[PDB]
Symmetry: D2
Subunit: 483 residues, 4 copies
């Protein structure tokens, strides 16, 4: 099986290729052609030209209809997209089917609808001569949007950027993660088959440094770079586009906390922290890797979580009651197991997990690890401060509300937090004091595409979602008429 | 020893001082204490800590009242601020009195008012269990705002950042231009006398590279850097904050066009382009340095503009009919004159100006140049494409509408444009096609503080004004309650 | 044919029926069962109950999809809807096909979209005790919406109300005009086939006074009455709902002017006023019945419009180049011809028309009149001040801009106005001074569903369109949480 | 003393006068001159004319500044305003001082501020010919606003209407309650001394039916009638303006509930219901006259409330620890005592109060009654369903959440409700189900002037507050430019 770039309406190979590997069993899924600098230039230029072609002449309404057509096309190939996400990543099929693929479809439909409903502003003003002036704003396409995305929820995060970009009338050059190229390549097929004009959507495959990703970031022809990934990568990209002063929007790492207050529904909080720590095998940017539980219920919480964690089924994506697939790759697993050893070196108690399961079948050639809970580290331990991106959490007791707020906030990251409490005042009083972009109370990972989304501190720069997307992916121009 | 830093509620000197020179006559006005890195650190830490003191406990209504007090305090010392602005810059007293200081005061009043009226959003959503969830947003202080400002409209541009920063509950570390330190120092005393708590507003003086500006830019304690100045400096700052992923907001250079169609009110357009070319001796970022005039009215337009330009009075800030003061510095004057010569070398006709006036008095020791009009350069001439930031414009003829639109947009800058036409269709049709942040029709430099304001391409990153400032200077946090 | 009511998911007949006559030839199209007070009661109660059923449990997203399905269901039977509107009203087929049915579909699709994208407000406040409070707002269904609609654009105006009502989660009892019952009845079939729950949409046929219209209006079970029709009728309805303080939204009569300035594109203005005067045989509330033309071009304009009006083809709905059908009914034609005579009596010069065309075939039994232009009446003439609602206009000269603005505003009505001028300032200066809900410049009847729509003075009460509909058809509720 | 009307910038008397009685001691405070129909016409015509005068030429910033000048004028005579409100209404001095006058001043400042920051909308649209069109909206003054207001919080409720009316550039004819004419008359002096142009604000004294209130409501010269008062009065006014189709905004009666759940903070709930029942001697429209308390805490609740109610000091407005003044007048006291008896006759147990206190001084000639608590009535009792508007409440046990929601909602009124609970889910789940305009959770009568305010069913029509006021008190006009 082979995955080509899609540039100016044509699927094309490249001089070099790389392997896409199935993390479940370590087997080759496909060969992926790595776009070189010459090909990235071709994509950007094609995207610049497409802005002046038929795409650029579409009414907002016709543009929106075509985008609903893109979504219809994904839906018409639903299970192919499910199979592509699962193969690349080891994601349980049930989660790809009910969450990932429908959300990627919803991304297109929501931003197409926002495109149709969105409007801008009128400001009247007085002038010296008494005749007045009017200032009105308009939204125009920003230009060519460079999209660079990660491997953890590949189609969802890719379309989260591509949908608003296109809804705002931009053209796109998009570089998915080398670990998860397939569903982006299928999306290119859907675009083609839907009649999306050539150059409007371009797909380039490859890596970051000295590859497609870096070349995209360096190209003078883009107007913006939108990015989801590691904070360090964000910094590198920000430096790269600096001379061009390109617009930038970054969703970066986190080390998210969950707080369980004494008045929590304890069984629910146990279930919720279980989901927030081990969903996608801890490979969601929104996962909790630090947990704070009031001292009065600490021991009961930890015992309860251990029992639930140990009932998790780790195995095949379509295995009967499977809860966790593997990590994305052998390389990522090396990093996570290296953090497993560090926790022990730092003096953790391993409440459960802390190694890899033994399957005695092909899964032993994949990249699985066990769900893991630690106890007994200090707030300054590396395993409590650094993002691990695996199925892990450290649990720590606390006594006082102001205390735990400060401890949650004591971080260079600030993406998300989940809080468990049945008390009205506490929910609102505490939530507003947490230094993050997103707080959930008594739940986790609930998303409404209308809301602003982003992080603070090292977890990002800017916000997207709803009108924040419509603003980021557009030129906002002011036109002032003297009457 | 005259102009001090203001750090954590105290005026402090520094280890070294630099001269502030009057561009009217080259005389020493004052010595300015240059903040060193240790003092910049002290300012950022004090601002960090002030977020945790009484300032951070004010209601939005009390904060807004205090900000109106700052405004009142400027008003109460109105003529001192005029004198300080005039001394530093050579600005005509009439202009500083009727435009600069009033507009500085309006920045504070407008952002104080917007702080009281602003609200956020409520999103209801359905959930699988049928009980729903509520998502709501809140604006919170972003943190410590680093402000780095330019010399051209010193107090106006300084307060354009400081007012929204404070209105959103932030604390501030602000570095005005080394060329124009006085009004900002007076503002520090106004803050002090109004009882702004210590650490909320801090003033550090100095240069850019290897001085207070660079140091502010590198400090991990700030949450954002908002900047107005040269594009190259914007790039440098973007790189400097990259490792911290700090929020950035840049208002950068331009090479703005004016366009005059055959159906313009010719006298009004001549008057308008005279203002847009030579106001503040061509030292406003929004000035026109490129002008395109329809061939049918070209000669008449140039002839009329020459007449009006030669009637401009260039002299003392309190001289009876003064229109233009000097340039900001000898150093800037040398650069503008280097362009004056480049224009001739590039083949220009000098319609008027092209040199420095001879005053036969102390003004000859200052930094004056003549209002200058060029004709005969090609679109690729350096003098037609690089920002000069002096009292100059090149005038070129055009024939077709799509032609002049292309020539206007054929630039790495895109700050503003002015269009002169009496035709309703043309006004709206052409304006929407100009790739800039701001288009004026039949006027220039009308500003309503509610409007989004910014540039595209090298002219900027992001937008400020109205809700765009309220959003930039705030954390926008989403709180999601499961019901 | 027979047209039944639709009450609680069942098509039902009534004790009595009335004739629906084809205005083309006077022939019987169908019998229509007239709802009595008892059936109106059944519809209202069923509507109240359906609010507590499955309809009320739908998510906004599922409600919007069901509303898109209604729209699909109309599309699926598009030509039946065309044939129904044409039969009832004599509308040229081309207009019904390109304008009326597609707009009725768009009403559902647009308000379904708005429902998905709409949100509400979050207000934070300080309190004495320093802990604060949160006020958030929600949009809830108002309840049962009573809809009473007119005969001139039957399906379009009927769905303009029913779409937002349903999109906001309300249930509906709707009473279309007795002259034009067919497309509304077809719409009930679409609702049924699409699986809209019983009681959500109820259709009651009948008249106004002493019939279904009045009975709806008196029923204490409705929460709102939204209405489009004559100002007099509006006044009657307002009195009727007064004891119950029902929410009301009225779009009422007009006596709309067109103004043609000396710098107009004259040929385009002639064509414009032709359309605004004689579209739908002058039976649109937005038509121009008063026209003011600058003295310098008055004679040429009148002569030009005469020529164009005499070129209009008045004939069968599917006749080759047909432009005008008949009036709605013999009774309406009696009223219009009564004004034709009054005009002559008031001293008008009949420039063209002023009677009935003679066909010498079955159309002579229909309700046709001639397009008519008058000249020579004073501003106080009844024919210049009272709404005729036929294909007529009076044309008068003017000299001065303030004079003509005053003459346009000298009316108890204030729905719309169209202005013709090529001049940028004049367009904006004059438009803002016209005391109406809607001004068009160099066009007429361009409608964007997101805009506010409504009239002033006798022409209405309230606004609909965009968020104004979302607000009118919802309870806006404030919830204040003390923290 | 004498209270004059204020018409076209002159204080004027009338042919007839009526007495203003102090309810504390039944002494005459002043004679009030009753506007006749001719004086009302004179006021309306002056307001119409003033729209075309200097008022109408003010920039929004100058208008706002003059409105702040009105507020300043009130502040400068603060204690005079306090004395006026106290004299008229018997309201405790501390309450008029810390709440009523300050809030009246804030009404002006807040709507002045909103006027400066408010803006409107721009909609771009595609057209057949590919050139497009622009629709923009503007806010214009609606015209002459008729204001009719109640006696319970005279200045607060008066200025709640007058402030947005004027902030939106309208002119005003205002008729305060005959029971409380003083603070409004003082306000006219402030308007006069602040230099508000003649005709902009006109004050007419008199009664309702066959007096100034009725004449206002019948005058064809107004553009809107905004009203706060009884529901039957609202219905009367709605009929009165119907023929002119005037815009209407009604804030009408309530029979508001408070609900105390088992998990409430009991002492806080007891204090909260004490305030919500007996504030202003129960003469606020927002007061709780019905209380539902969970069965498990009902007895403890009633006993607590009895104690706290009996601690209330009923007496002189300036008496040391005074909590309650008298009722507004002897007539109102007759109605309230009539209810007190009816409560007995209907089966009520009197837990406390139920008659009039005995002073043995001039207060016995006043209009005092005792704070009263009933128990043992059915949900259908008149005393439980009809608004009494005195310091009274009935308390009833409940068991189930859905039960008490249904009992709260089983009312022809729907103004406000307060809920007491410490549980997060319950607070939000129950609040959204209460069919009123305003729900408070764990507090009462907290008011943020940006929020929408209004009632459902008999409690009102329309919303006011924040942009809801900016919309109601303005013409929203759409201007569509074909390009
Ligand atoms: N709205 C706008 O877009 C706008 C408005 C006004 C001026 N400008 C631009 O500003 C420029 C003129 O002002 P200027 O000469 O003062 O610009 P500048 O870039 O040379 O300096 C501006 C500020 O940045 C500081 N600075 C310089 N180097 C720095 C560094 N390495 N690190 C941190 N800070 C540094 C300076 O000390 C000064 O305070 C023009 O390009 C003009 O177009 C833009
Ligand atoms: N936010 C609210 O909804 C709110 C607020 C405060 C008071 N209220 C209500 O106000 C009522 C008590 O106030 P009130 O006793 O002064 O009401 P009142 O209705 O009887 O009338 C108040 C005003 O209306 C005038 N008026 C009376 N009859 C009129 C008529 N026929 N035509 C024109 N004007 C007429 C009166 O002169 C007076 O100025 C209560 O029902 C209370 O619920 C409601």
């Amino acid at each position: 099986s082979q995955l080509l770039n899609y540039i100016d309406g044509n699927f094309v190979t490249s001089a070099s290729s790389f392997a896409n590997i199935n993390p479940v069993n370590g087997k080759l899924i496909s060969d992926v052609f790595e776009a070189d600098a010459k090909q990235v230039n071709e994509a950007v230029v094609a995207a610049q030209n497409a802005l002046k072609g038929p795409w650029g002449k579409l009414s907002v309404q016709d543009r929106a209809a075509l985008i609903h057509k893109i979504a219809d096309g994904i839906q018409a190939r639903f299970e192919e997209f499910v199979a592509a996400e699962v193969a690349d990543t080891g994601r349980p099929v049930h989660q790809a089917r009910t969450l990932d693929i429908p959300r990627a479809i919803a991304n297109f439909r929501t931003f197409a609808d926002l495109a149709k409903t969105s409007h801008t502003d009128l400001f009247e003003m007085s002038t010296s001569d008494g005749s007045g002036a009017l200032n009105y704003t308009v939204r125009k396409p920003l230009g060519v949007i460079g999209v660079i995305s990660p491997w953890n929820l590949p189609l969802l995060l890719f379309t989260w950027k591509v949908a608003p970009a296109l809804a705002c009338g931009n053209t796109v050059v998009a570089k998915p993660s080398e670990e998860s190229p397939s569903s982006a390549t299928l999306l290119a097929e859907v675009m083609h088959d839907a009649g999306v004009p050539p150059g409007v959507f371009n797909l380039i495959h490859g890596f970051g440094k000295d590859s497609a990703g870096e070349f995209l970031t360096q190209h003078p022809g883009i107007s913006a770079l939108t990015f989801t990934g590691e904070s360090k990568t964000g910094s590198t990209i920000m430096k790269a586009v600096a001379d061009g002063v390109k617009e930038v929007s970054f969703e970066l790492g986190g080390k998210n906390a969950a707080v369980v207050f004494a008045d929590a529904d304890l069984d629910a909080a146990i279930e919720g922290v279980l989901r927030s720590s081990f969903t996608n095998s801890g490979q969601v940017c929104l996962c909790s890797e630090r947990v704070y539980v009031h001292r009065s219920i600490f021991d009961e919480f930890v015992s309860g979580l251990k029992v639930e964690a140990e009932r998790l089924v780790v195995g095949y994506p379509d295995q009967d009651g499977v809860n966790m697939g593997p990590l994305i790759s052998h390389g990522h697993r090396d990093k996570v197991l290296s953090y497993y050893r560090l926790a022990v070196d730092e003096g953790a108690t391993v409440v459960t997990g802390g190694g890899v399961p033994k399957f005695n079948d092909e899964r032993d050639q994949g990249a699985y690890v066990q769900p893991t809970i630690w106890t007994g580290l200090s707030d300054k331990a590396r395993c409590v401060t650094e993002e691990i991106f695996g199925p892990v959490c450290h649990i720590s007791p606390f006594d006082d509300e102001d205390e735990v707020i400060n401890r949650v906030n004591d971080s260079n990251y600030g993406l998300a937090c989940a809080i468990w409490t049945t008390n009205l005042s506490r929910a609102h009083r505490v939530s507003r004091q947490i230094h993050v972009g997103l707080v959930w109370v008594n739940t986790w990972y609930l998303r409404d595409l209308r809301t602003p989304f982003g992080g603070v501190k090292l977890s990002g720069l800017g916000r997207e979602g709803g009108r924040f997307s419509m603003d980021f992916y557009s030129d906002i121009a002011n036109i002032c008429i003297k009457i």
